[PDB]
Amino acid sequence: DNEFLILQVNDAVFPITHSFGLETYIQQKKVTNKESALEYLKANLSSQFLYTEMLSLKLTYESALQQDLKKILGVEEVIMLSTSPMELRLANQKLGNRFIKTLQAMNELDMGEFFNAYAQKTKDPTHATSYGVFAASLGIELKKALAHYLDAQTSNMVINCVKSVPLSQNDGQKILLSLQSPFNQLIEKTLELDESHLCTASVQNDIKAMQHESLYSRLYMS
Amino acid sequence: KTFGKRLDIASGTAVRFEPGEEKSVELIDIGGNRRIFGFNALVDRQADNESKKIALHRAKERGFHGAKSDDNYVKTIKE
Amino acid sequence: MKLTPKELDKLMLHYAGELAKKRKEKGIKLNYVEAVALISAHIMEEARAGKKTAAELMQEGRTLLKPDDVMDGVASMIHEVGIEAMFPDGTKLVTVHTPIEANGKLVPGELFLKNEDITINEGKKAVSVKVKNVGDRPVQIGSHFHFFEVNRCLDFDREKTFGKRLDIASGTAVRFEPGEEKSVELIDIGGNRRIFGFNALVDRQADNESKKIALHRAKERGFHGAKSDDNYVKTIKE
Amino acid sequence: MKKISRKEYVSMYGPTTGDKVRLGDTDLIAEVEHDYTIYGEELKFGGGKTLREGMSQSNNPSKEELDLIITNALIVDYTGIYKADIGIKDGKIAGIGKGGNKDMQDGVKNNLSV
Amino acid sequence: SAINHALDVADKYDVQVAIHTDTLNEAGCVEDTMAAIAGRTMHTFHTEGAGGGHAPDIIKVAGEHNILPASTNPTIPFTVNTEAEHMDMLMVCHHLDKSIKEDVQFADSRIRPQ
Amino acid sequence: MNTYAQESKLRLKTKIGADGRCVIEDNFFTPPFKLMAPFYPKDDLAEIMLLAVSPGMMRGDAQDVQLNIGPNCKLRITSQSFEKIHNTEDGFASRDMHIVVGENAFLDFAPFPLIPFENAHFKGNTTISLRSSSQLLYSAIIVAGRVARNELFKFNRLHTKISILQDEKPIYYDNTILDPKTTDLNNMCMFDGYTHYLNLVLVNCPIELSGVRECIEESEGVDGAVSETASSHLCVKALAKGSEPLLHLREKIARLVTQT
């Protein structure tokens, strides 16, 4: 059903390489063990994921419910012009393009006239905004869509951390299981956030993302 | 508690404390300019909160009973 | 109409400005005196009118004279025109800075400087000290203040700085903002090296023997970063 | 030691050796022939300047202590066009040269004691 | 040190001492100045601070017995134009050149309409 | 609740003078703002100091700055000292700065670091407008507080919005929000134990990313990085324990830009 299609498109897009600065943290020896990785993940989810991805997802969901294509495009432009790190900007653009292409090609079903028009008129679609507008057009619940997106992104983050630190699958499962309460807290925060906090400037995360370009050997795209 | 104060009795009278005896006395602020000079030379200046610390340190050094000054006392340029 | 000497002076200034204005209307290029008088008289009249504030008058004074209305060199000579004007809320000082744009043709009293830097405190080696302002207010230290005796809210290794002063242009100052940590360069105090005054921590010749006394005094008076031994041996005079 | 730009130095203390100044609006240019000051020890009066108790004003002055000192003046005279501090004492010119405090500065004669 | 010595000599000779305190907090704050005064009669100029670094804490000394506080003309009464002229007056009075970056940066005021 | 008698405004408009120097064509300032004559160093750009006659921004302060640099003006705009945000009890201190740079004009906006005190609430809104040929070197340093006295992230809230438009088209957006109540700014993603944060934007400057990266790497005591924004303009973000390394890095980058 809807959950099956969400899982299918998520698997076809995201698993089918992006570190978002985690590689830089590991190379600079700031993330070493389970507790350090958990602290990094909590901080990243609290600042950058919350104020750049979840907030943008909620804003795009509201704008698509109101059928505000101009508002969606303005939000995308704000995100693009606020994303200072080149690696982060390129990763977001690539993920959004991949999501749009997968929806256009693999999903042989009536996604929606609004979504089709948005895809045909957009220029730099972020992955979070694309998922938000897709959920809004499909009628998915806002809280459920946010929970699913956050869970998928955190699963990718924990598997990347377990591959790169490296950790054990036991530690990966532990950090996946121990983040349930922060997930609910982040969803509750997004439930009361607003557009004024969109793309709140993270400092150390952006610095590490930009230093990822100057890293000696890059095992991750961004 | 008694820095800057005097007994609240008729001027020219005195209060006697017998050895070992404990009494309760009433004290009132010294009037006028409140410049304390003479006595035991513990103040020798205007009576205010800043001179209170110096007076307390002097009294503790000279062994006046009940005078409590902090162990880590910071001296001033003139004291 | 009891007139004060200030009022008589202002009347003279106003009519000097009127003469300058009449000459400007005739088309004579104003000289230094005429330009200053014109600006001052205009400001006084506007203040008497009372429709403008002192800030508005400071802005407006810079628009009275164009560069082509004055002789060559007048704009260079006039740096600022101050005038005490009586507003509806009393007498206020209106200062107009650079009221006329310089043409650049003639600059009276202009300097023709060499293109070579001045080396100050030559032959004196400077040491570097890290200073933190742990107080709540900014602290400015002059070029010749004995750095050992600066505000006790500044935190640094005072032992390193005994007998030294800031290595900056004399008459300038270094500002330490609260909480801010800066690195400063210090050079030995010259001459007889007799430190008198300041915080009365030395009040004598600055040498290694007076250094111990100064450090003990600073520790007693609570100067931050002053480290003196707990078992300090007093001298006969200290 | 430190080097500051000549423009900033001249703005702070006036022209020094080798600097030229136009006299009035005329075409005459006067060059500073020599300077009595010691760079970095110039006398300045103001808020946090050097002419202060213990820095340039001596706390143990000489008995020839000046009544008035003119600091950083460009002396233009038939004896030369140079830069110095003029000390005045008892209605006469007591000394010409580097004035200040002998306790904290070098090259200060007894007749130029501030 | 200067405050202490002047107050000693003035107590010897029965003369008043007036003070215009340190704006830069070079040697200490208002507490250090008051400790130097040491509860002796002192007549204070600009007890409101007049934008000095002792402001606004120097107003605290106006409650002490030994301090006779005075206030200057320009800041009374408080009007619409009071704050506009303060920096120009301060710079000219303290002899800081308005064409010098160092002097302008030095001319820092803590004046407040409050 | 403005404590000043009138609204705090600073309208400045600079143009090229008759003698070829950068002069102040027009200026109107109410307290605590003040403008002096521009300073002209021997070799650098014309310097203008935005004087603030106040110990710092307090509750109810609402400053409105409007700078207008005309064509062919090489201006560096600095401040008198560190901008301190005092304890705003129930209100906040707000600054709204609108800058307009003309054609072929270079503006080096290099204010001193901002130091928020305990329970400080500040709202800054900077809007810079440029032409195609305009060059801008914007900078902003934020301190965690009075670090030397263990006043770390004790302020109420720091909101700073920067909007840079080129040819009336948005090219840079920044929204720095620091709220210690909502989250710990000492975490590994916000400050990671650093106390001073420098954000610098180079628009149309003739400096290479390799040169900026070399400057950042050779700068000591600073964990910094430089990237290219969407509009192909350089953005530098640096962290340091003190403001001295950040100021040195900023002046190094400014010198590298100006020496071209």
Residue numbers in the entry:
A (entry chain P): 30 to 45, 49 to 254
B (entry chain E): 160 to 238
C (entry chain M): 1 to 238
D (entry chain R): 1 to 114
E (entry chain N): 229 to 342
F (entry chain O): 1 to 260
Provide the authors' original text about this structure.
Ni delivery requires urease to form an activation complex with the urease accessory proteins UreFD and UreG. Combining structural, mutagenesis, and biochemical studies, we show that the formation of the activation complex opens a 100-angstrom-long tunnel, where the Ni ion is delivered through UreFD to the active site of urease.
Additional substitution of E140A to HpUreD was found to stabilize the complex, and protein samples of H. pylori urease (HpUreAB) in complex with HpUreF(R179A/Y183D) and HpUreD(E140A) were finally used for data collection. Four copies of the urease trimers form a dodecameric quaternary structure with 12 protruding HpUreFD molecules. The stretching motion of helix H3 brings Val332 of HpUreB to dock into a hydrophobic pocket of HpUreD formed by Met36, Phe39, Met49, and Leu51. The UreD/urease interaction causes Phe112 to flip to an exposed position and thereby open a passage that connects the tunnel between HpUreB and HpUreD.
